[PDB]
Short mmCIF file of C-alpha atoms and ligand atoms in Angstrom, two decimals:
data_model
loop_
_atom_site.label_atom_id
_atom_site.label_comp_id
_atom_site.label_asym_id
_atom_site.label_seq_id
_atom_site.Cartn_x
_atom_site.Cartn_y
_atom_site.Cartn_z
CA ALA L 4 55.17 24.32 -9.06
CA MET L 5 52.82 21.73 -10.70
CA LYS L 6 49.91 20.67 -8.45
CA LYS L 7 49.20 16.93 -8.38
CA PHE L 8 46.03 15.08 -7.31
CA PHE L 9 45.42 11.36 -7.24
CA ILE L 10 41.64 10.83 -7.50
CA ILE L 11 40.05 7.89 -5.68
CA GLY L 12 36.53 6.88 -4.77
CA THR L 13 34.89 5.63 -1.54
CA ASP L 14 33.54 2.66 -3.53
CA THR L 15 33.35 1.29 -7.09
CA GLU L 16 30.86 3.36 -9.14
CA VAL L 17 30.82 6.70 -7.23
CA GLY L 18 30.91 8.82 -10.41
CA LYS L 19 34.67 9.48 -10.02
CA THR L 20 35.04 9.97 -13.85
CA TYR L 21 32.11 12.40 -13.88
CA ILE L 22 33.93 14.45 -11.20
CA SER L 23 37.24 14.29 -13.15
CA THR L 24 35.40 15.77 -16.19
CA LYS L 25 34.10 18.65 -14.01
CA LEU L 26 37.65 19.36 -12.71
CA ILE L 27 38.94 19.31 -16.34
CA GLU L 28 36.10 21.68 -17.40
CA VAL L 29 37.10 24.19 -14.64
CA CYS L 30 40.78 24.12 -15.75
CA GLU L 31 39.86 24.44 -19.45
CA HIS L 32 37.56 27.41 -18.79
CA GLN L 33 40.20 29.19 -16.61
CA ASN L 34 42.94 28.55 -19.29
CA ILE L 35 44.88 26.50 -16.69
CA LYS L 36 47.20 23.93 -18.34
CA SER L 37 46.12 20.54 -16.98
CA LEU L 38 46.21 16.86 -17.86
CA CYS L 39 44.19 13.98 -16.40
CA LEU L 40 45.68 10.50 -16.47
CA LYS L 41 43.71 7.22 -16.21
CA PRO L 42 46.75 4.88 -15.91
CA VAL L 43 44.68 1.70 -15.30
CA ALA L 44 41.25 1.36 -16.98
CA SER L 45 38.59 -1.33 -17.55
CA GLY L 46 35.50 -1.70 -19.81
CA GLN L 47 35.67 -0.83 -23.56
CA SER L 48 33.39 1.93 -25.06
CA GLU L 49 38.34 0.61 -29.14
CA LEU L 50 39.10 2.70 -26.02
CA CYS L 51 37.76 2.33 -22.45
CA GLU L 52 34.72 4.46 -21.46
CA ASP L 53 36.61 6.40 -18.75
CA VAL L 54 39.56 7.02 -21.12
CA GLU L 55 37.12 8.32 -23.81
CA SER L 56 35.36 10.52 -21.17
CA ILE L 57 38.66 12.21 -20.23
CA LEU L 58 39.80 12.63 -23.86
CA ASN L 59 36.40 14.20 -24.71
CA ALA L 60 36.68 16.66 -21.73
CA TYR L 61 40.03 17.87 -23.23
CA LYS L 62 38.45 18.27 -26.71
CA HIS L 63 40.95 15.63 -28.01
CA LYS L 64 44.03 17.84 -27.21
CA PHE L 65 45.54 14.59 -25.83
CA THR L 66 45.69 10.94 -27.01
CA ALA L 67 44.72 7.71 -25.13
CA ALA L 68 48.44 6.76 -25.09
CA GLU L 69 49.25 10.08 -23.30
CA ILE L 70 46.78 9.33 -20.48
CA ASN L 71 46.50 5.52 -20.16
CA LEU L 72 49.08 2.76 -19.65
CA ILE L 73 47.02 -0.45 -19.07
CA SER L 74 43.43 -1.41 -20.04
CA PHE L 75 41.13 -4.38 -19.15
CA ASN L 76 37.83 -5.24 -20.63
CA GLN L 77 35.82 -6.97 -17.91
CA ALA L 78 34.22 -4.63 -15.32
CA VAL L 79 35.75 -6.47 -12.31
CA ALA L 80 39.38 -6.13 -11.31
CA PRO L 81 41.69 -4.67 -13.73
CA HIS L 82 43.43 -6.97 -11.21
CA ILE L 83 41.51 -10.22 -11.59
CA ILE L 84 41.51 -9.69 -15.43
CA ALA L 85 45.24 -8.99 -15.28
CA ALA L 86 45.75 -12.40 -13.61
CA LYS L 87 43.42 -14.16 -16.10
CA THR L 88 45.27 -12.62 -19.07
CA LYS L 89 48.73 -13.19 -17.53
CA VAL L 90 49.71 -9.51 -17.45
CA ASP L 91 50.96 -7.39 -14.55
CA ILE L 92 49.72 -4.07 -13.19
CA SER L 93 53.18 -3.03 -11.92
CA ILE L 94 53.61 -0.28 -9.29
CA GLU L 95 57.02 0.70 -10.72
CA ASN L 96 55.70 0.94 -14.30
CA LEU L 97 52.70 3.02 -13.18
CA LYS L 98 54.94 5.27 -11.02
CA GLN L 99 57.29 5.88 -13.98
CA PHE L 100 54.32 6.60 -16.27
CA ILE L 101 52.89 9.21 -13.92
CA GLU L 102 56.19 10.85 -12.82
CA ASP L 103 57.21 11.14 -16.47
CA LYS L 104 54.57 13.94 -16.80
CA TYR L 105 56.27 16.12 -14.15
CA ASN L 106 58.43 18.03 -16.66
CA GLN L 107 55.51 18.90 -18.99
CA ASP L 108 54.36 22.56 -19.03
CA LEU L 109 51.32 21.82 -16.82
CA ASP L 110 49.90 23.76 -13.90
CA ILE L 111 47.86 20.76 -12.64
CA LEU L 112 48.13 17.00 -13.08
CA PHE L 113 45.20 14.82 -12.13
CA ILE L 114 45.54 11.06 -11.91
CA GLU L 115 42.28 9.12 -11.86
CA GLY L 116 42.77 5.77 -10.13
CA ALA L 117 40.97 2.42 -10.58
CA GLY L 118 38.36 2.43 -7.80
CA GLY L 119 38.93 2.70 -4.05
CA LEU L 120 42.04 3.18 -1.95
CA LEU L 121 42.69 -0.51 -1.28
CA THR L 122 41.52 -1.71 -4.72
CA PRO L 123 44.18 -4.37 -5.52
CA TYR L 124 46.65 -4.13 -8.36
CA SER L 125 47.68 -7.77 -7.62
CA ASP L 126 47.15 -10.29 -4.81
CA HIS L 127 50.10 -8.51 -3.01
CA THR L 128 49.67 -4.82 -3.93
CA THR L 129 46.98 -2.18 -3.80
CA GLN L 130 46.41 1.26 -5.26
CA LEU L 131 47.62 2.73 -1.91
CA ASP L 132 51.08 1.27 -2.66
CA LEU L 133 51.26 3.41 -5.80
CA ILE L 134 49.85 6.55 -4.12
CA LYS L 135 52.33 6.16 -1.21
CA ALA L 136 55.26 5.67 -3.67
CA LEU L 137 54.22 8.90 -5.50
CA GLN L 138 54.01 10.96 -2.27
CA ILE L 139 51.28 13.19 -3.78
CA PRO L 140 47.93 14.33 -2.34
CA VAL L 141 44.61 12.61 -2.83
CA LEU L 142 41.20 13.89 -3.88
CA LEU L 143 38.47 11.60 -2.53
CA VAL L 144 35.12 11.34 -4.32
CA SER L 145 32.29 10.14 -2.06
CA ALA L 146 28.91 9.17 -3.55
CA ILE L 147 26.28 10.25 -1.02
CA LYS L 148 24.08 7.27 -0.17
CA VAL L 149 23.30 5.09 2.86
CA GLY L 150 26.62 3.69 4.09
CA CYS L 151 28.82 6.46 2.64
CA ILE L 152 29.85 7.82 6.01
CA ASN L 153 31.48 4.56 7.10
CA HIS L 154 33.24 4.28 3.71
CA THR L 155 34.43 7.87 3.61
CA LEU L 156 35.79 7.79 7.20
CA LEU L 157 37.49 4.42 6.64
CA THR L 158 39.22 5.75 3.50
CA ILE L 159 40.29 9.03 5.23
CA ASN L 160 41.70 7.00 8.17
CA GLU L 161 43.69 4.69 5.92
CA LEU L 162 45.19 7.75 4.15
CA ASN L 163 46.13 9.19 7.57
CA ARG L 164 47.79 5.92 8.66
CA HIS L 165 50.07 6.07 5.58
CA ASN L 166 50.70 9.85 5.75
CA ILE L 167 49.04 10.46 2.40
CA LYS L 168 47.74 14.05 2.33
CA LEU L 169 44.03 14.46 1.72
CA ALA L 170 43.83 17.56 -0.53
CA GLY L 171 40.07 17.40 -0.25
CA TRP L 172 36.92 15.36 -0.53
CA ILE L 173 34.01 15.88 -2.89
CA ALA L 174 30.42 14.89 -2.26
CA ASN L 175 28.99 13.41 -5.45
CA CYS L 176 25.25 13.78 -4.80
CA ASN L 177 24.46 11.73 -7.90
CA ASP L 178 21.10 10.44 -6.65
CA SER L 179 18.48 13.02 -5.65
CA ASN L 180 16.30 10.31 -4.06
CA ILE L 181 18.83 9.90 -1.23
CA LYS L 182 17.38 11.40 1.92
CA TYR L 183 19.30 13.67 4.33
CA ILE L 184 22.13 14.50 1.92
CA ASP L 185 23.14 17.66 3.80
CA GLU L 186 23.12 15.75 7.16
CA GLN L 187 25.37 12.99 5.75
CA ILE L 188 27.84 15.58 4.40
CA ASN L 189 27.82 17.49 7.72
CA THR L 190 28.49 14.22 9.62
CA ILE L 191 31.46 13.32 7.43
CA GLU L 192 32.85 16.84 7.95
CA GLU L 193 32.40 16.71 11.72
CA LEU L 194 33.78 13.19 12.27
CA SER L 195 36.66 13.57 9.80
CA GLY L 196 37.55 17.19 10.52
CA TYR L 197 37.61 17.93 6.75
CA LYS L 198 35.14 20.41 5.30
CA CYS L 199 33.61 19.19 2.02
CA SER L 200 35.51 20.74 -0.92
CA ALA L 201 32.49 20.67 -3.28
CA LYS L 202 28.93 19.33 -3.34
CA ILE L 203 28.16 18.20 -6.88
CA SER L 204 24.62 17.26 -7.95
CA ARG L 205 23.13 16.25 -11.34
CA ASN L 206 21.65 19.80 -11.55
CA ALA L 207 24.43 21.95 -13.13
CA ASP L 208 25.47 24.88 -10.88
CA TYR L 209 28.13 27.62 -10.93
CA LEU L 210 28.85 27.15 -7.14
CA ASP L 211 30.16 23.73 -8.31
CA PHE L 212 32.67 25.58 -10.46
CA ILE L 213 33.45 28.16 -7.72
CA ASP L 214 34.03 25.40 -5.12
CA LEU L 215 35.93 23.12 -7.58
CA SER L 216 38.15 26.04 -8.64
CA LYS L 217 39.14 26.66 -4.97
CA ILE L 218 40.67 23.13 -4.77
CA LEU L 219 42.96 24.16 -7.65
CA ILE L 220 43.93 27.61 -6.23
CA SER S 14 28.22 -16.70 32.94
CA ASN S 15 31.97 -16.14 33.27
CA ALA S 16 32.63 -18.52 30.34
CA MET S 17 30.36 -16.60 27.91
CA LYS S 18 31.94 -15.88 24.50
CA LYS S 19 30.90 -12.58 22.85
CA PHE S 20 30.97 -11.54 19.19
CA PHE S 21 30.13 -8.13 17.75
CA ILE S 22 28.91 -8.59 14.16
CA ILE S 23 29.63 -5.85 11.64
CA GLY S 24 29.37 -5.52 7.88
CA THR S 25 31.64 -4.15 5.14
CA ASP S 26 28.65 -2.03 3.99
CA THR S 27 25.00 -1.35 5.22
CA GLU S 28 23.23 -4.19 3.22
CA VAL S 29 25.57 -7.24 3.26
CA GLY S 30 23.14 -9.82 4.69
CA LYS S 31 24.42 -9.44 8.28
CA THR S 32 21.05 -10.56 9.75
CA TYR S 33 20.87 -13.66 7.54
CA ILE S 34 24.32 -14.64 8.85
CA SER S 35 23.17 -13.97 12.47
CA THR S 36 20.15 -16.27 11.91
CA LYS S 37 22.51 -19.01 10.64
CA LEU S 38 24.73 -18.56 13.71
CA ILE S 39 21.63 -18.75 15.97
CA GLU S 40 20.52 -21.94 14.10
CA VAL S 41 23.93 -23.64 14.74
CA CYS S 42 23.66 -22.81 18.47
CA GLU S 43 19.99 -23.90 18.81
CA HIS S 44 20.75 -27.23 17.06
CA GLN S 45 23.84 -27.93 19.25
CA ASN S 46 21.85 -27.01 22.44
CA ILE S 47 24.31 -24.12 23.02
CA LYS S 48 22.65 -21.37 25.14
CA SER S 49 22.89 -18.19 23.06
CA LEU S 50 21.33 -14.77 22.69
CA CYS S 51 21.60 -12.34 19.78
CA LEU S 52 21.16 -8.62 20.33
CA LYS S 53 20.35 -5.90 17.81
CA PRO S 54 20.88 -2.89 20.15
CA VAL S 55 20.28 -0.28 17.39
CA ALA S 56 17.95 -1.24 14.54
CA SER S 57 16.55 0.48 11.47
CA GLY S 58 14.00 -0.45 8.85
CA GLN S 59 10.51 -1.45 9.89
CA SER S 60 9.30 -5.05 9.34
CA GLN S 61 6.80 -5.81 6.54
CA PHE S 62 4.42 -7.34 9.12
CA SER S 63 4.77 -5.36 12.37
CA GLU S 64 5.77 -2.14 14.17
CA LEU S 65 9.16 -3.76 15.05
CA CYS S 66 12.30 -3.51 12.93
CA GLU S 67 12.84 -6.33 10.39
CA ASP S 68 16.13 -7.49 12.02
CA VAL S 69 14.53 -7.58 15.49
CA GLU S 70 11.70 -9.76 14.08
CA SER S 71 14.24 -12.05 12.33
CA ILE S 72 16.18 -12.60 15.60
CA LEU S 73 13.01 -13.18 17.62
CA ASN S 74 11.76 -15.73 15.03
CA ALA S 75 15.18 -17.54 15.00
CA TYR S 76 14.80 -18.06 18.80
CA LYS S 77 11.08 -18.95 18.47
CA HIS S 78 10.24 -15.96 20.77
CA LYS S 79 12.16 -17.44 23.78
CA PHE S 80 13.27 -13.77 24.21
CA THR S 81 11.35 -10.49 24.09
CA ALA S 82 11.90 -7.56 21.71
CA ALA S 83 12.99 -5.46 24.77
CA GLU S 84 15.64 -8.09 25.60
CA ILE S 85 17.18 -7.88 22.16
CA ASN S 86 16.81 -4.21 21.13
CA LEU S 87 17.28 -0.87 22.88
CA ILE S 88 16.74 1.71 20.04
CA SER S 89 14.63 1.25 16.87
CA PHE S 90 13.97 3.53 13.86
CA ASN S 91 11.47 2.98 11.07
CA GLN S 92 13.54 4.56 8.26
CA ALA S 93 16.38 2.58 6.66
CA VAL S 94 18.87 5.49 6.76
CA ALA S 95 21.93 6.32 8.96
CA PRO S 96 20.51 5.76 12.51
CA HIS S 97 22.19 8.83 13.96
CA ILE S 98 20.40 11.05 11.43
CA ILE S 99 16.92 9.80 12.50
CA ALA S 100 18.03 9.91 16.14
CA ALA S 101 18.88 13.65 15.74
CA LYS S 102 15.53 14.33 13.93
CA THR S 103 13.48 12.43 16.57
CA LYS S 104 15.32 13.67 19.73
CA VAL S 105 16.75 10.21 20.50
CA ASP S 106 20.30 10.02 21.91
CA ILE S 107 22.20 6.91 20.76
CA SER S 108 24.59 6.80 23.75
CA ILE S 109 27.69 4.60 23.93
CA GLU S 110 27.25 4.29 27.73
CA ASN S 111 23.59 3.23 27.43
CA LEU S 112 24.39 0.66 24.71
CA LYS S 113 27.40 -0.64 26.68
CA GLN S 114 25.20 -1.09 29.80
CA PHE S 115 22.45 -2.80 27.78
CA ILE S 116 24.95 -5.33 26.35
CA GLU S 117 27.05 -5.87 29.53
CA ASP S 118 23.87 -6.39 31.59
CA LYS S 119 23.43 -9.71 29.70
CA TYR S 120 26.70 -11.07 31.10
CA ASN S 121 25.12 -12.43 34.29
CA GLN S 122 22.72 -14.66 32.26
CA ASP S 123 23.21 -18.41 31.71
CA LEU S 124 24.52 -18.06 28.17
CA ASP S 125 27.43 -19.77 26.43
CA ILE S 126 27.48 -17.30 23.47
CA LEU S 127 26.33 -13.69 23.07
CA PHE S 128 26.08 -12.23 19.59
CA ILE S 129 25.65 -8.48 19.13
CA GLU S 130 24.52 -7.47 15.63
CA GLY S 131 25.65 -3.94 14.83
CA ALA S 132 23.90 -1.16 12.78
CA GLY S 133 25.94 -1.12 9.49
CA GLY S 134 29.68 -0.75 9.08
CA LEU S 135 32.52 -0.23 11.54
CA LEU S 136 32.46 3.56 11.31
CA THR S 137 28.73 4.04 10.91
CA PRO S 138 27.98 6.94 13.30
CA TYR S 139 25.96 6.70 16.48
CA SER S 140 26.14 10.55 16.75
CA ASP S 141 28.05 13.54 15.36
CA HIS S 142 31.03 12.47 17.56
CA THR S 143 30.87 8.67 17.94
CA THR S 144 30.77 5.59 15.73
CA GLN S 145 30.03 1.87 16.19
CA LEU S 146 33.79 1.40 16.71
CA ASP S 147 33.62 3.48 19.96
CA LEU S 148 31.13 0.96 21.36
CA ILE S 149 33.17 -2.03 20.15
CA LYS S 150 36.30 -0.51 21.76
CA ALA S 151 34.39 0.10 25.05
CA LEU S 152 33.15 -3.50 25.14
CA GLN S 153 36.62 -5.07 24.60
CA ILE S 154 35.12 -8.04 22.69
CA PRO S 155 36.03 -9.65 19.34
CA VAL S 156 34.39 -8.81 16.02
CA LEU S 157 32.88 -11.00 13.30
CA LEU S 158 33.01 -9.29 9.93
CA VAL S 159 30.43 -10.06 7.25
CA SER S 160 31.62 -9.18 3.72
CA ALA S 161 29.13 -9.31 0.80
CA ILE S 162 31.13 -10.52 -2.20
CA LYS S 163 30.59 -8.04 -5.02
CA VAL S 164 32.80 -5.62 -7.04
CA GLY S 165 34.38 -3.23 -4.52
CA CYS S 166 34.23 -5.69 -1.62
CA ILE S 167 37.99 -6.10 -1.49
CA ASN S 168 38.64 -2.42 -0.82
CA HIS S 169 35.87 -2.33 1.84
CA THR S 170 36.89 -5.52 3.60
CA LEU S 171 40.59 -4.52 3.78
CA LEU S 172 39.71 -0.99 4.97
CA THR S 173 37.50 -2.45 7.73
CA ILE S 174 40.12 -5.00 8.87
CA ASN S 175 42.84 -2.33 8.94
CA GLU S 176 40.70 -0.02 11.05
CA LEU S 177 40.07 -2.88 13.55
CA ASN S 178 43.85 -3.63 13.64
CA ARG S 179 44.70 0.06 14.31
CA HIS S 180 42.39 0.15 17.35
CA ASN S 181 43.58 -3.22 18.69
CA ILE S 182 40.19 -4.92 18.16
CA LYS S 183 40.35 -8.72 17.80
CA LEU S 184 38.96 -10.02 14.50
CA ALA S 185 37.43 -13.39 15.46
CA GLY S 186 36.90 -14.00 11.75
CA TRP S 187 35.45 -12.78 8.49
CA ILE S 188 32.60 -14.39 6.56
CA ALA S 189 32.11 -14.25 2.81
CA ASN S 190 28.42 -13.73 2.18
CA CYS S 191 27.94 -14.82 -1.41
CA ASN S 192 24.32 -13.55 -1.42
CA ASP S 193 24.42 -12.85 -5.17
CA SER S 194 25.13 -15.94 -7.33
CA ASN S 195 25.45 -13.62 -10.43
CA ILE S 196 28.69 -12.04 -9.10
CA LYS S 197 31.70 -12.96 -11.20
CA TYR S 198 34.98 -14.30 -9.76
CA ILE S 199 33.70 -14.96 -6.24
CA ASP S 200 36.52 -17.36 -5.29
CA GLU S 201 39.17 -15.03 -6.81
CA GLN S 202 37.89 -12.12 -4.67
CA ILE S 203 37.80 -14.22 -1.50
CA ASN S 204 41.35 -15.41 -2.26
CA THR S 205 42.52 -11.77 -2.80
CA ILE S 206 41.04 -10.71 0.56
CA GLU S 207 42.75 -13.64 2.32
CA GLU S 208 46.15 -12.87 0.71
CA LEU S 209 46.11 -9.09 1.29
CA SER S 210 44.60 -9.22 4.82
CA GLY S 211 46.38 -12.30 6.13
CA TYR S 212 43.04 -13.73 7.42
CA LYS S 213 41.67 -16.96 5.92
CA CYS S 214 37.92 -16.78 5.31
CA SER S 215 36.01 -18.35 8.28
CA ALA S 216 32.99 -19.36 6.18
CA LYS S 217 31.70 -18.99 2.62
CA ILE S 218 27.89 -18.70 2.74
CA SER S 219 25.78 -18.99 -0.45
CA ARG S 220 22.01 -18.85 -1.28
CA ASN S 221 22.04 -22.71 -1.25
CA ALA S 222 22.42 -24.40 2.20
CA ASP S 223 25.52 -26.61 2.63
CA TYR S 224 27.19 -29.02 5.16
CA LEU S 225 30.46 -26.96 5.03
CA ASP S 226 28.34 -23.92 6.12
CA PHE S 227 27.34 -25.30 9.48
CA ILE S 228 30.72 -27.00 10.11
CA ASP S 229 32.57 -23.72 9.31
CA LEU S 230 30.11 -21.58 11.28
CA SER S 231 30.33 -23.97 14.26
CA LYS S 232 34.18 -23.68 14.20
CA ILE S 233 33.93 -19.87 14.68
CA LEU S 234 32.12 -20.56 17.99
CA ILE S 235 34.58 -23.28 19.16
NA1 NA B 29 58.95 13.41 -19.04
NA1 NA B 30 52.07 -5.92 -0.33
NA1 NA B 31 49.07 10.72 9.13
NA1 NA B 32 21.85 -8.82 34.08
NA1 NA B 33 35.02 11.07 18.87
#
């Protein structure tokens, strides 16, 4: 009965990790047994910054080896760094790593990906290939800024083409200088047909936790 | 002109240097004595020096004012935000039918090439129920895709190409706009896009002018 969510962004640097920490915080506060994986990571803090962020959200209940399989140091590709260092980001190895968690006593398993939907894992594979092999739903994090509507709709359409369920989308309103935030969110909802699951801003709010909790119910 | 070739120019994101590429395409035509026109039917972002939008001014300057602002643009907004949002706030309807008529009305002119510069990405909205793609579909013309090479460009370029392919829209070519010389692994990213998409890059444009630039850009038109 374990719920599973593969977390992707609409672009690189949409605050996806920040959202993962908020989802972890909701589970922890509700005494829900959860785990958040970061199977592929880049950019060192010994451990990568996103790996450290997730371990810190769980108050070190888990280890880096329990959540991460492969790490890169340059903030470009995991995939271009993988080719430069002569290592592979293998779909089968990542699939086995994630599916191995399915018999743990968890209510929810989150899997934070390595950027966008078609972020490559090689010059012949993308993150979609892994998500499609897993046959699990996606949680899409959209950073609200000029151009986000095009990126959010493109990502939702690609998911639809490959019959990957969209469990929900989250508006990361990480920049209060962006004008017409509410209008951009309403447009994405209208054009996509998906109501926004949660509107998260820098200003901490309990509605964030109420809305985030509903994704998990 | 019955022989007129048409190209709808779109970007992988809102600020990818689309207009700079359009000015280079105009320059190749002007130099080869090819009769061309470049439209910017929907524009946003006021010029630094006039009441007109910056992209409208760039196109007019590229043609040395052989055309008027009314010939190249139908709808303009001062704010550099999603055009449909300003349109809704200012009681302006961005209509697919009106844009289609504005563009198709140029087809009886003595032009060898018609460029139409779009207003952001493929799915940038024109309203709460339409996007740029609806106009492109209605026009039945090929697209030129401008991709700014930067981290995240692979995902955006592949998503845009796949959306074109789903709606049976011809991709005339994609251009790598290497507008930021500080970006790491530029050739590796272009190579990844070519291998995953199946489309060889039509032209690699950098901050420094090159012979390859004009040869490659000319080949898109021939
Ligand atoms: Na296991
Ligand atoms: Na493949
Ligand atoms: Na589907
Ligand atoms: Na006419
Ligand atoms: Na529609």
